[PDB]
């Protein structure tokens with residue numbers, strides 16, 4: 001029997017997009033989806049609704065919280081420092097969520113962040129499902145009970161090693177453990193410290209789910225199931241679905257003028273702005289490679305145009321070989337273009353999947369975020385599908401020479417590290433695209449959802 005599922009993702013394109021990818025897969029199986037989305041953002045999402053008779057959008061008015069810029073709905077609309085206020089605004093949709101649930105009456109609601117929700121749903125006879133599109137290795141590392149019980153005694157040296165029982169080994173740099181130790185305590189919406197919030201969601205929800213498959217995410221989901229004592233499901237790897245919009249002709253035309261596999265694509269997601277010095281170092285490192293490149297970057301901190309922040313003489317030197325662009329582009333379609341030979345990525349969970357299912361060599365440039373860092377360690381050291389750009393142990397900065405070297409290594413047909421990461425990437429792509437991998441993940445996922453509402 002088909003399920004009625006409501007979708008309440010965090011107000012971020014990196015959550016809205018994979019929730020919609022998964023929605024399409026569930027609707028193909030006959031399930032009815034009530035998709036809650038910020039009102040103005042809906043128009044950008046219709047693009048991806050492949051089953052409009054089963055997937056219905058319901059608009060949310062993102063309320064006012066003092067400090068929130070006017071009209072802002074998504075982390076793509078605000079600077080990263082304003083994220084906690086946007087969290088307070090999502091907390092404030094409670095009364096209009098509670099009324100949407102009362103009239104739509106879904107059996108299950110997938111959600112992010114709103115740890116108050118399982119108390120509404122238990123009252124309405126609805127099952128709460130905390131559905132993560134970030135890595136379970138990240139939640140396992142920072143938010144498992146052993147971490148939470150040390151409370152404010154948790155230090156940088158504590159975060160340098162995994163929590164007790166953690167199934168895997170990898171190394172953090174000093175500045176990364178420093179980042180995790182401090183940001184953990186910073187308020188993220190309505191006065192709740194960040195890790196407390198996520199922990200409250202894990203503890204109070206009926207069940208948990210993650211993007212991923214047993215072959216890669218398995219050990220972390222088993223660890224989390226053992227720790228929290230409730231089902232931790234895997235949706236499958238949420239392979240990107242095809243959009244209804246073709247590749248913009250101006251990009252298709254420009255990309256079509258380069259030799260196959262010759263272009264370096266660089267993008268750091270839609271939520272981040274580099275500091276100027278690292279913006280310069282990145283762009284000069286791309287220039288040093290001599291390869292054509294497309295860099296999708298916001299202007300650096302303190303700057304409003306790409307023009308004003310480019311290193312001196314940059315435009316005149318790179319000529320038609322390189323473009324630096326700050327607008328939203330169709331990243332998934334660009335990564336499928338045969339010109340692209342290399343993807344320099346901030347290691348966001350969605351960008352990681354998009355690179356894995358394509359042919360591009362991966363260069364890992366994780367930005368200062370626990371999931372990006374952990375994704376980078378897993379891709380660089382466990383799966384060994386990419387080369388990570390070296391950062392200063394204490395300052396977290398890279399040089400233009402380190403960017404150049406990483407790209408050169410993976411682009412060199414005769415370099416043995418490049419051949420190795422190509423070979424390992426092919427292994428992972430062949431697994432994720434295996435004819436029965438995602439479908440069998442979804443088979444199990446949907447059975448376990450049926451048990452949940454039984």
Ligand SMILES: O=c1c(O[C@@H]2O[C@H](CO)[C@@H](O)[C@H](O)[C@H]2O)c(-c2ccc(O)cc2)oc2cc(O)cc(O)c12
Nearest residue numbers: 012014075083111112113134138142198369370371
């Ligand atoms: O990056 C993280 C993250 O997601 C991310 O949290 C950012 C705020 O810190 C936000 O800006 C991004 O849009 C979002 O993808 C979340 C998260 C996401 C959805 C949830 O339902 C609950 C938690 O937990 C984290 C926990 C960590 O120990 C470290 C992290 O790095 C993240």
Ligand SMILES: O=c1ccn([C@@H]2O[C@H](COP(=O)(O)OP(=O)(O)O)[C@@H](O)[C@H]2O)c(=O)[nH]1
Nearest residue numbers: 014269270271328329331332348349350351
């Ligand atoms: O100009 C852009 C920037 C991002 N994306 C998409 O936005 C999502 C970004 O998610 P990810 O987790 O990689 O990073 P974030 O942007 O949340 O940091 C992915 O599906 C990208 O393909 C896109 O299509 N165009």
